[PDB]
Amino acid sequence: VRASIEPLTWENAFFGVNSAIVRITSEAPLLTPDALAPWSRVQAKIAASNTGELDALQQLGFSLVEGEVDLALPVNNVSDSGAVVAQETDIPALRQLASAAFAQSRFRAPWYAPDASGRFYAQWIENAVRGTFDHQCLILRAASGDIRGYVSLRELNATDARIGLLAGRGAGAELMQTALNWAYARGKTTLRVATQMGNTAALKRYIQSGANVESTAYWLYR
Amino acid sequence: VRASIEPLTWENAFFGVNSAIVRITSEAPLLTPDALAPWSRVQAKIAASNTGELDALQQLGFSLVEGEVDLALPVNNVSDSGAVVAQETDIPALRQLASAAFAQSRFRAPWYAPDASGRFYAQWIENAVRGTFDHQCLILRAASGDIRGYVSLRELNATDARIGLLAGRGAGAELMQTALNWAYARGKTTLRVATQMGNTAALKRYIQSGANVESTAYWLYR
Ligand SMILES: [Zn+2]
Q1: Architecture (CATH level 2) of domain B1-222
Q2: Start and end of every N-acetyltransferase domain (chains A, B)?
Q3: CA B101 vs CA A168, B122, B125: distances in Å
């Protein structure tokens, strides 16, 4: 395989690691054990259809971390869920929720430190709260005022929005409604959402809501 | 991880290999390098959600071959597709079609010999034709009399049928309708179909026809 190797700038500073990501292309140098040597961690994300790349990377010492499915739904606005835009006072509780809900991610041990995944997703949801009109965390509340669920959303382009994080036991359907509402308000035609291949509950929920598969991928690390 | 190691008798005789499959169970002996060592190939299939088993098997030197998504469709009275039950005289044409269309299964190179996948699936489609009223291959013909698409089906139990093989360019929708009609006719509520994680075209078509995800898995070999 031929591939460039690029430092993961944000993750390196955030995790305190010396990691890089491989980008497979015809025009890059040969990917060799020597090119891979000066890194504490190397990541690669390949199309699940590309078995040629899977075995080239495995032969270089990479291992499967997880599969990813990316899906898309037409928008299609719907029942106002009553969700509200998260405010700065919600950050402590959302960080606590997100670090727990997304504890088992591609940043799991033994690839990263035990606290890495929790930190990463807590930062993600905080970043969405401190976002912009086009990057927000929306919250559904119970009648008590407690957070029942949350969904983070971002504009991708003129037609598309993407769900970042979505979590809330028993609130999947209303969180999807919330996301569809948000995309529609911004004139988007398409809503995208990726999940882990192992997350059959999320896959089922998304497909029930009208989603279909756009792409599938493997994350591999060395 | 505790698992029994069970010889793959049928595959050993068909491919001319000496392989086994792992059966993970709380009751079984410890799965060790010593126990795995003498087999030319060892297979393992684990739920994609089970990262503990993934880590354990990678720590015994297993690699990813492919991801599988198993889906299920509700069965109802769909229209007739015009498909016909394949005959013994259709075998030669079906074997050739199947060997070409299913060359890149989990029986692909480098894990098996280059001809192995096509041999396996040609035998599969042949076996379908030679089956009962509860195992058939159904075909669609173009104007020329040529096979345009095919689908093999079997009854699983009182409520379920399963699609074995399905192929035919531009005949996807019709073949699904064919399979649903077959299942309906036999009093089934549920039609199951597995596909490779990388086969986004099949995933999209199954989901368009009403499928949702039932399970996801990795095939790992050593
Ligand atoms: Zn390896």
Answers
A1: 3-Layer(aba) Sandwich (3.40)
A2: 92-222
A3: 42, 10, 12
